[PDB]
Paper text:
Enolase is a glycolytic enzyme that requires a divalent metal ion (optimally Mg2+) bound in the active site to catalyze the dehydration of 2-phosphoglycerate (2-PG) to phosphoenolpyruvate (PEP), as well as the reverse reaction in the gluconeogenesis pathway. Interestingly, enolase has been identified on the cell surface of S. aureus, enhancing the staphylokinase activation of plasminogen. The Sa_enolase monomer has two distinct domains, a small N-terminal domain (residues 1–137) and a large C-terminal barrel domain (residues 149–434), connected by a linker region (residues 138–148). Biochemical and structural studies indicate that the octameric form of Sa_enolase is enzymatically active in vitro and likely also in vivo, while the dimeric form is catalytically inactive and may be involved in other biological processes.
The multiple functions of Sa_enolase encouraged further exploration, leading to determination of the crystal structure of Sa_enolase at 2.45 Å resolution. Structural comparison of non-ligand-bound Sa_enolase with yeast enolase reveals that the non-ligand-bound Sa_enolase presented here assumes a conformation similar to the ‘open’ conformation of yeast enolase. The primary difference involves the orientation of L1, with residues 36–44 moving approximately 9.5 Å towards the centre of the active site in order to cover the catalytic pocket.
Author numbering:
A (entry chain A), D (entry chain A): 1 to 434
B (entry chain B), C (entry chain B): 1 to 42, 45 to 434
Write the structure that this text describes.
């Protein structure tokens, strides 16, 4: 029954219109799994890199035929001839890491390897008749994540004078994930009206949120607040706010240079002034989470920021950790941050992904599983959040199926869990004292 | 074994963030089907059921529809011991159970959910690809895609009357190649827009709504993106419109001033035809959807006599996926193509009847998406099952659209050397 | 197929010769699970049900608990048609069926028996090793074992206050190697004791209770056995205590005179901390269990501030595998590790919640045996399922202990090249 | 279905902390059996010898990697390539005896061979859906054994001035095995109190019984009696006593030298005086069984002892017979003893074990299946006693799971047998006239 008999990859498209890898796994008894890999980075300092073709005359160089070939001609024959059972996730993942033989995964491609890794796990779940989350996390996978819902974009994703890349709402005060999703959409739609009445742009970006021409950061925040209240919810209690500052995008030579995005008179802040500024914002607005508040290399700044607001505010390393456990470990040992953004394709296997989540959790950090800019109809990250009782997810705004499909999968998971389902609300932030 | 043992509905979300119905069907032997219903309409149209509870989802909840499946439709199926393979008796039974031509008591969305999920479960039981279960052994023709790229009319702040502008990669050898071109043209257009300082964020169907100066600006810029990607506008890639002329038609006149400024022409039926013929003569346009008002039957006649031999004329608002109205169009020689919106008629059986009617009249049947979509890909399989030759399932952005394209890629891959992509020969309705 | 068709309990014996509960679960398809319950306690603790019939087993019979399974719990499961895979709903249902927080109406031992046997049967149905069914695909980390070797306090006639002395073979490469070392050290100690004319018979946990002269004699002799076996006390093998200080704590004072003669120090909270720090500075001690009284929260704070960065401080009596109390310890920064006794909380679900809480607070969760054990090996699989990193399951003597060790050997063997043994890195709770 | 497809051995630990062999057998249809071998002797005169590694730097020379290798590299390939069905116990056992080719089993190791032998039988029982006892003994295996329960130790297992190695209680007067076990524990626990009140040692030895510092043999016996009575049972009727004298341990040159263990003034008895002494003890105390009352080589003494008390007292050869049927046969032909201790690993296969039991039974002797000092979680000897309607077992005191697990298995066997179960009490001693 469980021996893997076929592993097949093909070229398909992601939510941005760019090629990506899809892999299908079949066992001798006919259990089946399909995996679609989200967009990645083909160059980087510390992450698994995906393999692109570079053929300027197909898909503007973004085709993934090489990665597809590597699956079909290198990985699949090793798996088939090895007679691996679909249940041996870790050996298969370890075999693929060694077969690529680079820390990068850049010989075979992180996209090739991950497609296989997830396809196998899904096939195993199908074979056992298990919901994926329980196969991945065992019998006690039951906690639905509080979602970080992208609502407004800035920085390099906007023309408006705003340095922070993304603003989010978090419906922590709901009692079920189902309710939390509802609130999200109500707030989203109310915001759309408000923007439309103001004559601002209503079309959406990659994450399915808005990038309107606000006057600045406070305009943006306060308008979100207004949308929360207009929908009938309370900002301090039921719905909270979050940032992805992506501060690396505007940091150079020890200066957080807000004028890269906020125009001539934007503040040029030192590390100590960046912290003061974020503390001010947090004392003013009901902000529960900040991603990349300091630069990916400003560890002293991260330290300062963690010492100052880390007891009562979640601080998420994205560019800081890059889903790398050697870097996460150094962060943990130095008391920097209290949360890590887990991007599955940035590390490249399910096994390594679960090791990062476990490492994070065991240090009292939160592990927030994350979408990419180019997503697919794959809903695996919803199952991973519940499998690990992660307590949080970041999978986009409240439009576009590349985002909504994950929310739908969470609805199905909560439904199926029935009376065993758990939604911890504010207690999901176990990384926080106050 | 094929007897249906569970029919279960659930409230989920569509691509616009509004509630829709999901239905799951199981047979005694463990075969499984899931359907999600696209966004619809709450005359002459199957209607979806919305809750109207101002405190939930702004009145757009579908708990009553979900409840109609679980408390009314499911027990009828289950107690009736219907086989999962008896698609037509199940659909028929649901139409009778609802009792109104509207499908308004149970909801088109309750009914269609079941209808699709039953078919998918049948395909699962039989080990068949869905397109082959639906269409028989000969379902093998991949559609030329109508790819939305620019929006106007009420979907834009720009002074353009027509609602959609489309590209059609007819000249490609395979569906796979044609999809590639779509994306390359689309990405070239994107960077041309940002180089002109125009807006790049997308709407419901994953396309652009840029502030162009006018209809000629939009078209000419689409053409330039096609050429900047290295494809020939006359032969490899054609253009298409959805004018949605019903939107700017008031009191016997096509009032472009509704969307196109203060000096937009007020146009008579004869002047519309002239303008459309002008555009067709001045640009490589192969299809026009709703070029005339839904009730301007005289105008439709005129337009079909004028350009029908060489341009596809698609009724959307004109036929509303209603076979009574389609029959009348055919009998009176109006149009040469019909947009099929599965949730607008409400069953798979009626959808296939509607397609069959169209095809037997020498019309093309263009299976279509809705503004609010889902992760569901059934419309891809319908297109191939009926060798329709065409599909309209959005731009090259948003998984709500791309998922359908991806499913066509899997279908073509699976079909291997039996797969067919006709290109310009897909337009069997066109005398030219 | 996964529906539970039989739940059956039976009176058997534990490793001390006292009655305990055995439960067997069967599914429709023939999948099978057997659990045996370890010895417990008849406040803030799940309680086991004892018969109290002075004419049977000296009042320790469990016929009423067995009867609660067979006449009350089983029919609820069977009539409810629970799937064997629905571990959390079954446990939840049993908690509600009992109704008291104690688990005192049905008995923690009735409930836990069912809970474990259901999981084992699920693992059997799925063809999965139990650690993988319980923990998901990534359960692969073998625990460093806390190996009891010498006993004191109320488990010895010798003048020693602390109840247990342990070795930890942290420096080993594999669990297999670490188990080997345990046995070699233990057998070397045995012959050193018989060469000194000291007692060699073993207690409940398979260790020794020799009449040493004092606490320094015991420790120094353990170290010598470690060195006589060719291992380095500082790096390869560390020591550990279970002081069980609650035992000699009266009226605000740690009264070593309870066990340590007539001139054993009466010690204040501050003087306990000093002494413990002294020992830690003078010997390679990596863990202390219950170094302070179960109710001396101020003292625990003090001790954790003092040595918590570099010594593991385990609450046993302090937390009583109760998440309300654990939460408070975490909130107040007391301890850095919790002893998990599955029968002290009473379900697998609550056990995993308790472990999860601990791990998420940066605490280690040390799965534990009880004085009265059985041939059951589930705690081995729990340790690996949760990648706990540690286990406390006895000395290197008695199958009640060795069976668990043997099961860890099978687990490691089965895991093959995926198996992990972290050694000193298992102490992720320790800043040093 | 029944063909053996895998035979696998590994190193595990016994109840004394020493390596032993564990073997697992699988058939093509997935029937499974696991066997753990108890401690043996690696040298001997007349027994199967187990194979130890002799590597002084692993497990102090007691590792069994060689035996494990022999299973995996010699026995398993013969079984797999031979395509033996799991049901052909005797051919497989005969094949292993010949493959080792020595009377000792010392080439491959008695531990290697037995592990396989039992694993196969268990797999066969699993394959057929049969309780093991019925597979081994056919449909009429239904008699629960009267247990010989170790309670007090002496001789070389004690510092106290007592020559006899072990003292036992036998709850012959109970009506079920279940009840008989209860009585055992009640007596055991009562004895523990009494000893504790006397200030004597309460820790346990290998068999889970006591080795306290009694004044001598009578002190020991009478204190056991006291514990019987204090628990509410009658010494002459419900509970009887037994010995393992292990008289070989203190015999030399025709002298039973009690001073080897009972100090300066211990009696030095001739063979005729040993018999008188045992007869005296039996007339004084309710002793129903004596193991190795005479030396393993003192056949004339054994004769004398059998002629004198053999009609009314059970006399068990352990060191005398060494589970060897050539020696048992000579004993039977010479009228020596009336019972034999069956140690499965001393002979080395299940087949040979059943031949010894059958030989014993057919001579009107009793066959008492026995534990070893180093035991395991294996419960096979419980099934063997019932399979053969042996009527007696010797599997230790009433503590330690290495002992209790056998008692538990007997409880399960009795339970499952239900109304067909049989516990003969005193009539189990069919070898006795009076
Ligand atoms: Mg239209
Ligand atoms: Mg303790």
């Amino acid at each position: 029954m469980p021996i893997i008999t076929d592993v097949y990859a093909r070229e398909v498209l992601d939510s941005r219109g760019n090629p990506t890898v899809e892999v299908e796994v079949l066992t001798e008894s006919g259990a089946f799994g399909r995996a679609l890999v989200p967009s990645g980075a083909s160059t980087g300092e510390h992450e698994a890199v995906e393999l692109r073709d570079g053929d300027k005359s197909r898909y503007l160089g973004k085709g993934v035929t090489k990665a597809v070939e590597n699956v079909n001609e290198i990985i699949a024959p090793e798996i088939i001839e090895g007679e691996f059972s679909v249940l041996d996730q870790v050996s298969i993942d370890k075999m693929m890491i060694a077969l690529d033989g680079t820390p990068n995964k850049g010989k075979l491609g992180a996209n090739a390897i991950l497609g296989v890794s997830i396809a196998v796990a899904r096939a195993a779940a199908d074979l056992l008749g298990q919901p994926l989350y329980k196969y991945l996390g065992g019998f006690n996978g039951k906690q639905l994540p509080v979602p970080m819902m992208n609502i407004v974009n800035g920085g390099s994703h906007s023309d408006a004078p705003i340095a922070f890349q993304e603003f989010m709402i978090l419906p922590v005060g709901a009692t079920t994930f189902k309710e939390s999703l509802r609130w999200g959409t109500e707030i989203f739609h109310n915001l759309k009206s408000i923007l439309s009445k103001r004559g601002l742009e209503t079309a959406v970006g990659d994450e399915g949120g808005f990038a309107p021409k606000f006057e600045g950061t406070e305009d943006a925040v306060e308008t979100i607040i207004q949308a929360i209240e207009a929908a009938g919810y309370k900002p301090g209690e039921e719905v909270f706010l979050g940032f992805d500052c992506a501060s690396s995008e505007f940091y150079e030579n020890g200066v957080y240079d807000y004028s890269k995005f906020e125009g001539e008179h934007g503040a040029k802040r030192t590390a100590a002034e960046q912290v003061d500024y974020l503390e001010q914002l947090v004392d003013k607005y009901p902000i529960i989470t900040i991603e990349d508040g300091m630069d990916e290399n400003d560890w002293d700044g991260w330290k300062q920021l963690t010492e100052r607001i880390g007891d009562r505010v979640q601080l998420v390393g994205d560019d800081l950790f890059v889903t790398n456990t050697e870097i996460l470990a150094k962060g943990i040992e130095n008391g920097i941050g209290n949360s890590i953004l887990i991007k599955v394709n940035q590390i490249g296997t399910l096994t390594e992904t679960f090791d990062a989540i476990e490492m994070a959790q065991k240090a009292g950090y939160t592990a927030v599983v994350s979408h990419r800019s180019g997503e697919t109809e794959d809903t695996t990250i919803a199952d991973i959040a519940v499998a690990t009782n992660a307590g949080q997810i970041k999978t986009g705004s409240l439009s576009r199926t590349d985002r909504i499909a994950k929310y739908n999968q969470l609805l199905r998971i909560e439904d199926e869990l029935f009376e065993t389902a758990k939604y911890d609300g504010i207690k999901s932030f176990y990384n926080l004292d106050k």
